[PDB]
């Protein structure tokens, strides 16, 4: 589609010129150059989660929550499929597998008007409001697209 493609390009161009993205709050990476597959990592998360990320950079790997946006399911008609790739989290409205129990991500709270710049922030917020914490035990294999789909499935 030309509309879905153009709309998507508009969004990424917005994100690029947003003070949110300039301030290092997150990043956007077109996995495999795909304009329909985004890796949005939250870099700047004053909260308990904000704490767990400090000792995340040091102990194991880097310091960020890695999100995956899939725009194949009829976006912007339907919400983008968003999931948590890593790290493994407790609470923050995160479901088994990495799916998010979030309002706007439903077919009853989403709007074609909403920006991807905003849904990212709402996720960064929902995670904090739900007092999300890093499960420093489980391996990343805990979170898979497979586990996220069937999970989000039951949700609906």
Curated annotation (Swiss-Prot):
Locations listed in the record: Nucleus; Cell projection, Filopodium; Cytoplasm, Cytosol
Tissue localization of expression: Widely expressed.
Post-translational modification: Autoubiquitinated in vitro in the presence of NEDD4L.
Stretches assigned to the UBC core domain: 3-156
Active-site residues (renumbered): 101
TM ranges: none
Entry similarity comment: Belongs to the ubiquitin-conjugating enzyme family.
Subunit structure: Monomer and homodimer. Only the homodimer is linked to ubiquitin through thiolester activation. Interacts (via N-terminus) with B4GALT1 (via N-terminal cytoplasmic domain). The interaction is direct.
Function summary: Catalyzes the covalent attachment of ubiquitin to other proteins. May be involved in hormonal homeostasis in females. Involved in regulation of B4GALT1 cell surface expression, B4GALT1-mediated cell adhesion to laminin and embryoid body formation.
Protein's recorded name: Ubiquitin-conjugating enzyme E2 Q1
Organism of origin: Homo sapiens (Human)
Residues of the full protein shown: 249 to 406 of 422
